[PDB]
Amino acid sequence: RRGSFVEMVDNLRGKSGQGYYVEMTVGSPPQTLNILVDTGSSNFAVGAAPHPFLHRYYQRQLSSTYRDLRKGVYVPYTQGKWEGELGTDLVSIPHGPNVTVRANIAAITESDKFFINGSNWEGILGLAYAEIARPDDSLEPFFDSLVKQTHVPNLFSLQLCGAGFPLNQSEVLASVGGSMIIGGIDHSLYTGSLWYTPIRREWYYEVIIVRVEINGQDLKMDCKEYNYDKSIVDSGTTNLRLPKKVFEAAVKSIKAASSTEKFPDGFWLGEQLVCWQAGTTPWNIFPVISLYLMGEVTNQSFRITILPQQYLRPVEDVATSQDDCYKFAISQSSTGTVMGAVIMEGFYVVFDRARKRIGFAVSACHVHDEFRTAAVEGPFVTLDMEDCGYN
Numbered sequence: 323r324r325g326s327f328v329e330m331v332d333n334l335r336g337k338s339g340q341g342y343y344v345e346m347t348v349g350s351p352p353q354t355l356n357i358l359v360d361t362g363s364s365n366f367a368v369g370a371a372p373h374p375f376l377h378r379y380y381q382r383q384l385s386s387t388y389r390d391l392r393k394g395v396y397v398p399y400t401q402g403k404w405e406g407e408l409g410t411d412l413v414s415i416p417h418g419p420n421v422t423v424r425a426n427i428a429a430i431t432e433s434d435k436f437f438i439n440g441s442n443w444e445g446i447l448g449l450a451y452a453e454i455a456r457p458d459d460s461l462e463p464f465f466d467s468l469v470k471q472t473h474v475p476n477l478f479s480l481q482l483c484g485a486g487f488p489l490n491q492s493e494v495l496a497s498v499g500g501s502m503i504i505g506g507i508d509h510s511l512y513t514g515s516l517w518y519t520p521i522r523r524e525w526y527y528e529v530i531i532v533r534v535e536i537n538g539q540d541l542k543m544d545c546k547e548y549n550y551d552k553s554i555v556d557s558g559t560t561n562l563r564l565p566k567k568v569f570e571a572a573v574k575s576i577k578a579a580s581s582t583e584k585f586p587d588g589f590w591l592g593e594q595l596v597c598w599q600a601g602t603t604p605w606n607i608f609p610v611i612s613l614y615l616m617g618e619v620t621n622q623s624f625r626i627t628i629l630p631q632q633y634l635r636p637v638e639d640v641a642t643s644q645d646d647c648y649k650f651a652i653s654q655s656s657t658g659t660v661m662g663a664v665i666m667e668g669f670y671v672v673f674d675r676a677r678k679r680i681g682f683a684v685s686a687c688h689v690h691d692e693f694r695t696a697a698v699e700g701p702f703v704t705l706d707m708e709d710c711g712y713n
């Protein structure tokens with residue numbers, strides 16, 4: 323396996339709790355900013371005014387290439403909001419393709435619970451499709467602009483690398499957090515085969531889950547439940563989020579598999595950390611989780627399997643200790659399944675926009691132990707998979 327995109331390998335930093343980001347520049351002369359990679363939204367937006375959590379921001383008045391679109395944008399969401407002013411400017415990715423494009427930029431002027439203290443990022447790169455752009459689908463997303471204006475192939479791929487232990491801001495700054503390969507697939511970043519699932523519709527990166535197992539035991543729900551009301555791949559969500567009824571069934575099964583140790587309700591609610599003496603985390607008592615995804619071939623599926631090393635998120639102790647501590651990074655959703663950062667950390671994920679498909683392979687940087695690894699395996703004969711999609 324040769325790695326043919328050396329310029330872009332190791333261009334991400336960050337972690338599942340706070341986001342993975344890439345360096346970008348905006349304006350003339352170039353203003354450098356760290357930008358959250360978000361496959362669950364479709365706007366390119368940057369801090370453009372002082373904020374307690376920003377150490378830098380886009381200064382439109384210092385860019386000779388700034389263009390004012392004379393239009394506001396307001397982006398409320400469940401846990402927060404940002405608002406700002408639309409414009410365009412020249413944009414580059416230093417550890418990216420050697421191209422500069424003119425792109426839409428939302429200059430964030432006000433926000434609430436959007437920016438994250440100590441995360442090191444100052445803006446967001448929404449990589450999903452125009453349908454979910456704000457204020458509407460007429461605001462061309464960045465990746466669309468990049469493809470239209472250059473010879474960059476209509477594809478990107480993400481290797482998000484969890485450390486398997488906590489990092490402070492200093493360690494995050496000094497550590498490689500993964501790769502975003504723009505326009506290609508780098509063979510050094512994965513092992514085994516890539517398996518592809520269709521993009522069901524181009525809005526979010528929507529997929530269809532057809533079967534769920536906990537340690538090989540079928541959760542045995544009608545597969546529509548797994549995709550109620552959608553299933554998406556979202557680097558801008560920390561957890562694996564599951565629809566309420568699926569969450570309840572999965573947690574029951576994970577508790578049963580791990581029953582040799584009792585954990586408090588607050589742990590299963592994703593609120594409370596649990597800790598073990600250094601090196602003694604009992605990985606083996608926790609089950610693997612397999613999600614079967616619709617394949618590209620009629621009546622064929624494949625599965626991705628994650629370990630507790632993926633779904634238990636490393637956190638620092640509430641106290642001063644050498645304990646190894648974690649939070650449970652599976653949580654309930656009322657807006658469908660979200661395959662967030664903790665599940666993406668297991669896999670190299672290929673967003674093949676050109677062929678309307680998402681590829682998964684075992685990540686070369688997934689955390690595991692001597693006894694088990696993450697897996698991507700197939701094929702399986704699976705019938706009536708279209709019926710698993712919610713309408």
Ligand SMILES: C[C@@H]1C[C@H]1COC(C)(C)[C@@H]1C[C@H]1[C@]12CN(c3ncccn3)C[C@H]1CSC(N)=N2
Pocket residue numbers: 337338339340341342358360361362363364365397398399402436437446454456556557558559560663
């Ligand atoms: C792993 C990393 C810590 C995670 C980042 O957390 C925040 C900052 C809350 C993510 C980046 C925020 C959003 C942006 N957004 C949105 N909705 C509609 C239109 C435009 N944008 C919803 C919102 C939550 S979900 C998501 N994918 N993106």
